Every structure is written in structure tokens, then in C-alpha cells.
């Protein structure tokens, strides 16, 4: 089965209202940049972002010129004429709208509260979908928490039923309407809903992991934002998942969540796989089409793992655009992030950047010695390792943020398509390296084990192993006279074949 290649197409209400395909100054990346060739390289395009209004219904930002919106969407849906399997999904949410302190957060929380609110919301999703010509719904609530999760799960299920029904009604059996969500790629935000991953994913075609932004201005030490594997020399973090409402014993939490650990793409993926009921085929790995810039970095190690003087507050407080060579930064008033397109031009313009490579994390980074700058980003080379990882771990595919940030030739998109589908590309010998692997073992991904059946009335010593009711258990201390599954002296360590 073909790997999914999901590209986000994000366009601000302002660019929609003034849409033009002949003025990079107004619309940096108009739809016309997506040629039939590029269209064939995508399986999905997530048009971003729609919202949930106070009436608790899916809707366009109120300041959106509807006619211009339809025009933009049509330009996207037209791409389907060059690729029968391409779907144009629309995403509800995003950071500005759905983060805890976002303008519309309350609407997400209230929309999923009851059967009535959930029904009305779901109906509005399918209604928007059909009205504008979309092929599915993607929800990017960043992120549901605590008491909100069950409502959220019930809402996805409600959408799932309406989509399937609409698929029949429209005779779309050849290209069924889909439902997906963007999930956190880091443990801190992931802990909010981790314990219910299986329930959340069940109604989805895919969960697209935001496996980037693993480093940012908010961190005390500079680091790669999307390391595939860990670097022992890099910073490590407390594994927040051990604070998730799982109901596991101390031994179980410790085994499943080593801490401190390396915040990496591999960690996020393995954290999702550890949970029973979460199929690797629904897991989509996200990769960034942009880099994050840091200033005030020390030398000695390419600017890696150094303190810095980068403002972390959002929006960018200052007016100091210190990312040498980045004109995009001036335009958007924030020197902390630059598109791959822009980064490439910075390298080409001889502004003093050295492109370096970390063979543990398998990712590139820029270092500016003259001004003390550090940039963590991804490129066609880092994608080789991630693409192989996706194939090896049998994941559903790749997702990226965002299309508008690739270079004009669409090299990043073309590389992803190449690594999954090109007959003349061969990565069988690509060396994955010796970076750190996430090795947690959760009661949801136990190894196949063998042990003598438990014998009632027997007294067991510490460390003994027995098979009992579908699992293999080990005693945590001695003089055990109780049956496994019972009391707390037994630790579930394996599955019975």
C-alpha cells in the first residue's frame, strides 16, 4: 500500500482576501506553484485553517471573503485532475485558534461536551466539506486535555459515522471521505491525552504526528527540533508521560518511560506504538519544511547545545531581525523561523552560514560564527533517514508543515515522493546510525515470552517467571503466595503466544 504524503497548505485570511498568483509580495506561495507533477507527489493536501465559532459549528474565519475562499479551494481541488487519488482535506484548528489561550479555545471545549453539541458540530463539518468541495476533515486542536478527551473522542466518532454515510450517499467508494487529526509530537503536550490514544485513533484514517518543534526559543539549550535519534551530548528531558493518567505501577511507568530521555521523532513514534490498539499503519510522521533560528549561541560545537539569547515570547517582542540574510524574517517580523526555501537562499548568498551535519540525530543545521547564530532544520538528506524509518516501522506515511515553505522547485516534496515510490532510488544500504533509540516497553507492546504456567498454592521467589492468563509475569520480591494479576507482587513482562 502506498505511503501517505500529506502536505499542509496554510494561507492566512489576509492572503485569501487578496489572493493573486502574480505577486510573491502579497501571496508568497500561490496554488499555481503546485504543478501537475507536484500534485502527483501528494496523496493529501490539508487546507489550513478553519475554526469553530461561538455557535459551536465549524466555520471560516469571519473576516474571510467567501468568494475568494472558494476560488482558492477550487484551485486546490482542480489539482485532482492530475491525480485521481489526491484528496483535498481541510483542517479545523491550529495554534492561534485552539491553544489553551487561543481566541477560539472555548468553542472547541464546548462543541464536544454533549451528544447534541457533538451532533451539531459534526453535521457542520460534513456540511462545510460538501459545500466547498473538500475530501475530508482534519482536526488540529492543540490540544484536548483532561475532561475534554472523552467528548473529543465521542465527537470524532460522530464525524466518522456521518462521513461514511456521506461516502455512500455520494457513491465515493472509490475515494472515501477521510477523518484525521494532528497529534502532539512531544511528550509534554502528548501527556494531556496519551492514556486514551487508542480510543482517539480508532475513528481515524490517520493521526499525523507533529514530530518537530522539539526544540524552540522556550528551551534553555539550543537543540535540533526534529532529531530522528538521540545524541548523548544533547539535552535530555523528564519523560512527562509518566505523569499521564494511565493507572500503571511504578515499575510499569519506569519501564515504559525512561527519564530523562532524548526528545526525538523516534521517541514520539515509539511512544504511540507502545499503546495497545494503536496501529502503526495509522501513524503518520510529520517533518518540518522550515528551520528554527537561535541567537547568542556559543561556539565550539556548531552552536549545538548552547545557551542563547533568543526571545521565546510569542509574538516576537523585539524588532531586531538578527537572522542575517533572511528577508522572509523581515516580511513576517520574526527572526526565529525561516522556510527551507529561504534557508537555501541564505546558504547560496554567502552570508556566513556553515551547513553542518549531526550523524547521530541524522539532521542538518546552520551555524553562523560571525554573529553567533544556530539553525535547526530538515532537508532532502535528513528525509532519507526518516523515509526509511517510516518504511521500517510500517507507518502510514509522512506529513509536513508546510507546502508553502518548499523551494520553488518543490525539492523537499519531490524527495519524499522519491524515497517512497521511485524505482531508481534504493535505500537498502542506508546506515541508520548509532544515535539513541527509544526503548520503553509498555504493557501495550510487551514481547512474546515463555514461562511455566503459574501453580496455585505455590510459593515463588523474587524474579520468578510464570505464564498466567495470556501474559508472563515476574515477582518483584520473594515469598509470593498470591496469583499474578492479583495483589501487586507480580509484574506483567510479556505476552503468551
Amino acid at each position: 500500500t502506498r505511503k501517505a504524503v500529506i502536505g499542509y497548505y496554510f494561507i492566512p485570511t489576509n492572503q485569501i482576501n487578496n489572493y493573486t498568483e502574480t505577486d510573491t509580495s502579497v501571496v508568497p506561495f500561490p496554488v499555481s506553484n503546485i504543478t501537475p507533477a507536484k500534485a502527483k507527489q501528494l496523496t493529501h493536501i490539508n487546507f489550513s485553517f478553519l475554526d469553530i465559532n461561538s455557535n459551536l459549528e465549524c466555520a471560516w474565519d469571519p473576516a474571510t471573503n467567501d468568494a475568494k475562499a472558494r476560488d482558492v479551494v477550487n484551485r486546490l481541488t482542480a489539482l485532482k485532475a492530475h491525480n485521481p487519488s489526491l484528496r483535498i482535506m481541510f483542517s479545523i484548528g491550529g495554534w492561534y485558534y485552539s491553544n489553551d489561550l487561543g481566541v477560539s479555545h472555548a468553542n472547541y471545549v464546548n462543541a464536544v461536551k454533549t451528544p447534541a453539541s457533538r451532533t451539531k458540530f459534526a453535521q457542520s463539518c460534513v456540511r462545510i466539506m460538501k459545500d466547498y468541495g473538500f475530501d475530508g476533515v482534519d482536526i488540529d486542536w492543540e490540544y484536548p486535555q483532561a475532561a475534554e478527551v472523552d467528548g473529543f473522542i465521542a465527537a470524532l466518532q460522530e464525524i466518522r459515522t456521518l462521513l461514511n454515510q456521506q461516502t455512500i450517499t455520494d457513491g465515493r467508494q472509490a475515494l472515501p471521505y477521510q477523518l484525521t487529526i494532528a497529534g502532539a509530537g512531544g511528550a509534554f503536550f502528548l501527556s494531556r491525552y496519551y492514556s486514551k490514544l487508542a480510543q482517539i485513533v480508532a475513528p481515524l484514517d490517520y493521526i499525523n504526528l507533529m514530530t518537530y518543534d522539539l526544540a524552540g526559543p522556550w528551551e534553555k539549550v539550543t537543540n535540533h527540533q526534529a532529531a530522528l535519534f538521540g545524541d548523548a551530548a544533547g539535552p535530555t528531558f523528564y519523560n512527562a508521560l509518566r505523569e499521564a493518567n494511565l493507572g500503571w505501577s511504578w515499575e510499569e511507568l519506569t519501564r515504559a518511560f525512561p527519564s530523562p530521555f532524548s526528545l526525538t521523532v523516534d521517541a514520539a513514534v515509539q511512544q504511540h506504538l507502545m499503546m495497545e490498539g494503536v496501529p502503526s499503519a495509522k501513524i503518520v510522521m510529520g517533518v518540518p519544511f522550515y528551520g528554527r533560528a537561535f541567537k547568542g549561541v556559543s561556539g565550539g560545537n556548531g552552536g549545538q547545545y548552547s545557551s542563547h539569547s533568543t526571545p521565546g515570547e510569542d509574538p516576537y517582542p523585539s524588532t531586531d531581525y538578527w537572522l542575517v540574510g533572511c528577508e522572509e524574517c523581515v516580511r513576517d517580523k520574526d527572526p526565529r523561523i525561516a522556510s527551507y526555501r529561504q534557508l537555501e537562499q541564505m546558504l547560496q548568498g554567502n552570508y556566513g552560514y556553515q551547513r553542518l551535519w549531526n550523524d547521530k540525530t541524522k539532521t542538518p543545521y546552520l551555524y553562523h560564527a560571525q554573529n553567533g547564530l544556530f539553525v535547526t532544520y530538515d532537508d532532502a538528506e535528513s528525509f532519507k533517514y526518516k523515509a526509511k524509518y517510516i518504511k521500517q516501522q510500517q507507518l502510514g506515511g509522512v506529513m509536513f508543515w508546510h507546502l508553502g515553505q518548499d523551494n520553488r522547485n518543490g525539492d523537499l516534496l519531490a524527495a519524499l515522493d522519491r524515497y517512497f515510490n521511485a524505482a531508481d532510488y534504493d535505500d537498502s544500504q542506508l546506515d541508520m546510525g548509532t544515535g539513541l533509540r527509544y526503548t520503553g516497553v509498555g504493557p501495550g507492546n510487551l514481547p512474546i515470552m515463555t514461562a511455566p504456567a503459574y501453580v496455585p498454592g505455590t510459593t515463588y521467589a523474587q524474579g520468578a517467571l510464570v505464564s498466567y492468563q495470556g501474559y508472563v509475569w515476574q515477582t518483584k520480591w520473594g515469598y509470593i503466595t498470591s496469583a499474578p494479576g492479583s495483589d501487586s507482587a507480580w509484574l506483567k513482562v510479556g505476552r503468551v503466544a
Binding site: G216, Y290, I337, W401
Partner: peptide, 5 residues
């Protein structure tokens, strides 16, 4: 924050 987040 700044991108997707």
C-alpha cells in the same frame, strides 16, 4: 507556536 504550533 511560530509554525504549526
Amino acid at each position: 507556536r511560530x509554525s504549526h504550533x
